[PDB]
Amino acid sequence: AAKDLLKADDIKKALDAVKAEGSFNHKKFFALVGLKAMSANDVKKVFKAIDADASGFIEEEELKFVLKSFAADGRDLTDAETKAFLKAADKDGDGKIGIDEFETLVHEA
Ligand SMILES: [Ca+2]
Ligand SMILES: [Ca+2]
């Protein structure tokens, strides 16, 4: 459901930059899409979407399908690509990326 909030071309540039099988980075991808500077409000709303299960948290499984809201079958993480997002979005090593953690990494991307 984040397709209406964004763009379009912004999703075609980030995915075209990481479509490879292991070329995803979390900083270059989100940096191109535009979430880096969207508005903390519409950002907490972007995360609310990343939370595919409704646990106010981004779990590793969501990280794999993190691009489903932008494309139902858009990017499909390769596993190693998921080990990058998790090791780049989790610092406390809790296995869960809350908002401040998510809106902090997405904005600093
Ligand atoms: Ca979750
Ligand atoms: Ca965390």
Can you walk me through this structure?
Ca(2+) 1 binds at residues 51, 53, 55, 57, 59, 62. InterPro entries: EF-hand-dom_pair (IPR011992), EF_Hand_1_Ca_BS (IPR018247), EF_hand_dom (IPR002048), Parvalbumin (IPR008080). By secondary structure, this protein is mainly alpha-helical. It has a single domain (1-109), classed as EF-hand (Recoverin, domain 1). The protein has six helices and two strands; from the N terminus they run αααβααβα. The protein has a two-stranded antiparallel ribbon. Helix 1 (9-18) runs antiparallel to helix 2 (27-33) and helix 3 packs across helix 6 (99-107). The protein is globular, with a radius of gyration of 12 Å. The structure holds calcium ion (2 copies). The site of one calcium ion has 7 residues, from strand 1.
Helix and strand pattern = HHHEHHEH
Q: Give the second-level CATH assignment, the architecture.
A: Orthogonal Bundle
Bound molecules: calcium ion
The main β sheet shows up as: 2 strands, antiparallel
| Neighbour order of strands in the largest sheet | 1-2
Shape: globular
The CATH topology comes to Recoverin, domain 1
Give the CA-CA distance, first to last residue.
Answer: 22 Å
Structural class: mainly alpha
CATH class: Mainly Alpha
Count of helix runs: 6
What's the β-strand tally?
2
